[PDB]
Design a protein around this nucleic acid. Structure first.
Lengths: 60, 214, 146, 165
RNA sequence: ACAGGAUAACCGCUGAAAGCAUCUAAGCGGGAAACCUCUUCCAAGACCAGGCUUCUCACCCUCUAGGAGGGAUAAGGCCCCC
RNA sequence: AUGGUUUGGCACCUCGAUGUCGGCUCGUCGCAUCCUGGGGCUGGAGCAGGUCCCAAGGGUUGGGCUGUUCGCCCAUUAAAGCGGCACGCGAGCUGGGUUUAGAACGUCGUGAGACAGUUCGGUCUCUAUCCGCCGCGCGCGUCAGAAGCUUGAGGAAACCUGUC
RNA sequence: GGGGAUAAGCUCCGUGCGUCGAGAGGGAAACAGCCCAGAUCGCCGGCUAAGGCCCCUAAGCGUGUGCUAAGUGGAAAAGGAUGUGCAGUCGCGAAGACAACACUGGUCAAGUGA
């Protein structure tokens, strides 16, 4: 959550985007990436943002 | 504003006023005081004047105190004390090295004397707090002077900080207010104050103008 | 295993937050988050990895409703009948810093580590602080939209 | 609400200065300064008036809009020619006079009674029984009038004391 | 004690919503042995451990020269003594 | 409608022990205020009250009778407040009452005996471990070691009233 | 359902009713009997139930439309009360409405009353 908010995204939206994108990396390695490899976490944040729907509050 | 001086309690005696009434007066050796340091808001944050009193041989002062006195510019004295004033205009009339003597007070003035009360040692409640002791007869068993009840029945089950019981008594700074100066003996530097001031004979006292009646 | 900070890993930065027209709860929550170090990816509840926080314009804090004259700050000395109560108004007019200090302190753990974290918070009623030598980074309370 | 919708006329001989919500007005009788409520804006109408415009219609704005209008009206009518309050006594043995800038009353008490005149007001005493106080602010004049009224408790039996005209 | 500040019941001034009125929802005032100051005392272990000054303001040895340890001192303190 | 201050009800609590009433000593708290303090209306002319609001800072006596609480009475006083806290306080005191064993009276029982009926007499144990409270030291800390004078966050004490 | 005063954290019965007893884990701050759920052991994997997402405290100072001024939220009654939103009526009224200056006349100027 701290690392995601450093990239201007909430933890829950990031998790939903990651699940939609199909990336199956668990929270342990996600935290490891956040601590050790910020560039990989930024790329994952970008793909999660891409995977998210246009209007998160839409009844879809 | 509020004048003041450092003095010594010499004793107590008797005088007769102009109506032939008796006046029990305490003799105070309001000897010469020298201003050693000036406290200002711009430097210390408060306005006060520091006075020195008493005489001691120059070989009795330690190096720091002797250095402070030399920096002030006067010979060291046994006692040093501060008089808290109210503002800078009050402290403007004191400069380092100025000598204060008894005639700053006048006949009929009201003063406040501050001193260390006499020591009474480890004193019980009957003496320390004015407790009334229990009966001395009618079967009372070894409770003629003990305080008795302390708390009560559980509930707080504690003793309520501030409970009055036995302990050390006396030896505390005490101020007596609105004492009338009956006579100012300028040539002896002696103040005749009607009433009783705290402390033993030869103790250090601070005579200040009354805050209520002045 | 999970990463754990070592002796020399922890680094601190200085944040200065302006309290002019800010809701006290919002500012206090942001300051508590900054002090706790929750905003760093290397956060660990064991370690005090927080950042030094400076608060200026403490007297300019914003209090909604009628809490200025109906919210009391209680304190008991321990003696019988030693309870003292002061509304936020007189507390602000007398000790402007204490309101923000209490607000922030109430929001962080009451452990020994919380006592240690309290050492990293400096608040000032004036518009300027003596910590210019540290070159604090201005901090703005923002919300990450989701 | 109803009263506030009508702009108050402003005389040409009195200056009106508007600085956001803080308003200062310089009249022949002196100067007065007023602050307007924050939900209401004010603007000097170009035809010789000021505009009391309420942008909201919730209870607060609809309540203070007319109040602000009448406050402006009182302020301008006080900077133009001020206010005058007239007082008198009923009974006997009561005497009122002016001692310079201060008022001295002998209501019958064993001690003399002095009245201190604050800024912006003056005492006019054309007779011991009846006298007047004048000023440029209605609130201050009314407060001083009430204070001067208060030197005697109400008398429902004989009506001895002071009452308004 | 005197004095000041904010107040309770209450007395009010200036006036809306509600074209008048209204001590009131904006405001501004008076108002008690209660409250905050004011009087006396304790109080920097107040861990935000404060401030103003003054005094000494230096000499070795060791392991290895990174730190540590030991010794002898200055200002000063304590012990023994009256 | 509040309260658990009165007698109640239940018996969850302790029978390998929680002293039972008054009094003394020492308290602390609530206000539903007895006096002092501030006001309103008076079926208040003034005096003095009646009554109702705000107000808990202080104070609120000494005796006779009874074990008494309660109560009545005698003098006063500004007033002689109501209540909570094991109906406060017996490892603080008393044993007058109640509540063992002796004895008597009235009544009940054939009798041993009995009576929230009466009367006389009748062992109140303890070297303070922990918390708590009142005082006093030792150690360390406050980024060199000391010494004078202090600011004070914070806290405590005090706060009565009469006549002329 | 009975008794008691339909008062008791009172008592006595009925229930292919539950739990505790004999039951861990999560929630209700703590909290045998309430809610989710029945622990064979390990994992530094994932999805969820009750309950939650400003900080303490893991996750939303989430999005949209309105209400609340009472810290209501975050205790309670008879009863009292020009608070306010919505909706529904009716009275009177531009032949000038209400107020202001019982019922009537003139100025005034849209709403005014239950």
């Amino acid at each position: 959550n701290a690392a995601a908010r450093a990239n201007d995204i909430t933890y829950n939206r990031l998790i939903q985007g990651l699940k939609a994108a199909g990336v199956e990396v668990d929270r342990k390695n996600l935290a490891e990436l956040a601590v050790s490899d910020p560039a990989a976490f930024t790329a994952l944040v970008d793909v999660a943002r891409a995977a998210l729907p246009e209007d998160v509050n839409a009844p879809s | 504003a509020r004048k003041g001086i450092l003095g010594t309690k010499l004793g107590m005696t008797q005088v007769f006023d102009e109506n032939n009434k008796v006046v029990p007066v305490t003799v105070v050796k309001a000897g010469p005081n020298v201003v050693t340091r000036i406290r200002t808001t711009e430097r210390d944050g408060y306005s006060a004047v520091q006075l020195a009193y008493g005489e001691i041989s120059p070989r009795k002062v330690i190096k720091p105190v002797a250095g402070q006195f030399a920096a002030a510019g006067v010979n060291p004295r046994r006692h040093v004390a501060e008089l808290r004033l109210d503002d800078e205009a009050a402290v403007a009339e004191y400069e380092v090295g100025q000598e204060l003597t008894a005639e700053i007070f006048s006949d009929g003035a009201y003063v406040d004397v501050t001193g260390t009360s006499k020591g009474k040692g480890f004193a019980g409640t009957m003496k320390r707090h004015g407790f009334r002791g229990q009966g001395a007869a009618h079967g009372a068993q070894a409770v003629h002077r003990r305080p008795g009840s302390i708390g009560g029945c559980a509930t707080p089950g504690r003793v309520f900080k501030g409970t009055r019981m036995s302990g050390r008594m006396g030896n505390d700074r005490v101020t007596t207010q609105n004492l009338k100066v009956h006579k100012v003996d300028a040539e002896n530097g002696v103040l005749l104050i009607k009433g009783a001031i705290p402390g033993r004979n030869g103790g250090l006292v601070v005579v200040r103008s009354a805050i209520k009646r002045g | 295993p999970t990463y754990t900070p070592k002796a020399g890993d922890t680094t601190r930065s200085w944040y200065v937050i302006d309290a002019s027209d800010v809701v006290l709860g919002r500012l206090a929550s942001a300051a508590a988050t900054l002090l706790r170090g929750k905003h760093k990816p290397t956060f660990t509840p064991n370690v005090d990895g927080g950042d030094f926080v400076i608060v200026i314009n403490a007297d300019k804090i914003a209090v909604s409703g009628d809490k200025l004259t109906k919210k009391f700050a209680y304190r008991h000395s321990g003696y019988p009948g030693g309870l003292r109560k002061r509304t936020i108004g007189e507390l602000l007019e007398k000790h402007p810093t204490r309101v923000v200090e209490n607000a922030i302190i109430g929001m962080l753990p009451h452990n020994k580590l919380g006592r240690q974290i309290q050492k990293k918070l400096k608040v000032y009623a004036g518009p300027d602080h003596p910590h210019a030598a540290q070159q604090p980074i201005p901090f703005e309370i923002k919300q990450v939209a989701q | 609400s109803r009263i506030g919708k009508q702009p108050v006329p402003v005389p040409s001989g009195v200056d009106v200065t508007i600085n956001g919500q803080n308003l200062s007005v310089k009249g022949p009788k002196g100067t007065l300064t007023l602050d307007v409520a924050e939900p209401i804006s004010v603007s000097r109408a170009e035809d010789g008036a000021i505009v009391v415009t309420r942008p909201d219609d919730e209870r607060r704005s609809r309540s203070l809009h007319g109040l602000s209008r009448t406050l402006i009206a009182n302020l301008v009518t006080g900077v133009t020619e001020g206010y005058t309050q007239k007082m008198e006594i009923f009974g006997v043995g009561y005497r009122v006079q002016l001692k310079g800038q201060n008022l001295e009353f002998a209501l019958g008490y064993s001690h003399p009674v002095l009245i201190e005149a604050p800024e912006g007001i003056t005492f006019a005493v054309e007779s011991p029984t009846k006298f007047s106080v004048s000023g440029i602010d209605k609130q201050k004049v009314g407060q001083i009038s009430a204070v001067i009224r208060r030197l005697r408790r109400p008398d429902p039996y004989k009506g001895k004391g002071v009452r308004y005209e």
